[PDB]
Design a binder for this molecule. Sequence first.
Ligand SMILES: [Cl-]
Lengths: 221, 219
Amino acid sequence: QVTLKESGPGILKPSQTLSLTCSLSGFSLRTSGMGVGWIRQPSGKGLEWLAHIWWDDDKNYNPSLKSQLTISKDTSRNQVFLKITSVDTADTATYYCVRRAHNVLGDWFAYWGQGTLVTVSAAKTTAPSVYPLAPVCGGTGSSVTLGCLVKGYFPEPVTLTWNSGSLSSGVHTFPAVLQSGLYTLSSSVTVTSSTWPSQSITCNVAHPASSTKVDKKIEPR
Amino acid sequence: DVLMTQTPLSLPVSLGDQASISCRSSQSIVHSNGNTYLEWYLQKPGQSPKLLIYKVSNRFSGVPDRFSGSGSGTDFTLKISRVEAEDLGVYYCFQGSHVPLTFGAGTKLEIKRADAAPTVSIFPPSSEQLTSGGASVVCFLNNFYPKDINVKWKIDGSERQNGVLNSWTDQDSKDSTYSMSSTLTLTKDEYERHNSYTCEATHKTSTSPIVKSFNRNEC
Ligand SMILES: [Cl-]
């Protein structure tokens, strides 16, 4: 496997410097004419090419960022580095390391890293507040939908389960939204009228960055 | 910079049908060495993009002969015959000829299915949230098709557009529908200044909203 592995902070503050390392194996950046670079993708957005560095230490940069971008390599370690100075919230994205050689199994992004999420924010670490969403009594039917609202956390991610994982069918967990600079997430779960409230339905929320795990039983109104 | 303009941005298709995706560049992407470095990539949820086609028309390893790339100069086309489930995701064109290298905006290849009405559910703020001095009113619009449903909030008859945050699921793998969450967040104070809370979901070209409501003078 010719592989590329991104590593570095994951969380930074505005005005600080983003520094990422790409560790390579299965090929040599010494080979004429090998090249490695960086592409980023903001959440729910497209792909933006950033820079590329070559076996000969030639380098190409996206002019839209040239005052902020530096690419470099360590040939002896087989590593490539990205620096973005003076970052701001808009630099929040998944950052991919990619291989691209020239001159003739190259000239393609056949080989991509897995990507690493980098968040730029002034927010402090904050456990979510977990709120139950029980139906209006009565409203009203074959089905009853319940929910869980995970509000005001930082940073991503959280994980949510229903009834420790025995409720997997009919679950919809929605992508978090920023109501800034904290995240809010919701999840709905639908059961038959027979099921609830006769049996207890509970929302399990974990927030690894704040080593929080919380449950919240949906009690009827 | 060279602009890669991709058309269309959403491509619903039925399994077995043909899909065609246009990529047009703002300038020639013929490199000075005489090659055209035009690639197509496919990205599925939570994964890196994968290469499908390079130098306009060559299939990468593992890409079946149902995919073919064609074109020249500034006009390029990706064609997928007999679309399969494994083909669904977001397709990106790209030019590697001129710096800065640029991608098209993406085309989402998704499954067509029969129109489906949302199961709509409204939820007042919890007592827990209210004792912390907040109020969020949540509405789930679940298992509908197509993706572009419209949601509006009314408070005491007055439609309200501020403080509303929406979120969408990806297409469901089992029933090919979409779901959405709509959350109106208020100060506890403004929440308690009104009685009636309404979530109305209008698909498409309707006509007839599915309306869900509650009135605090009863809850
Ligand atoms: Cl390569």
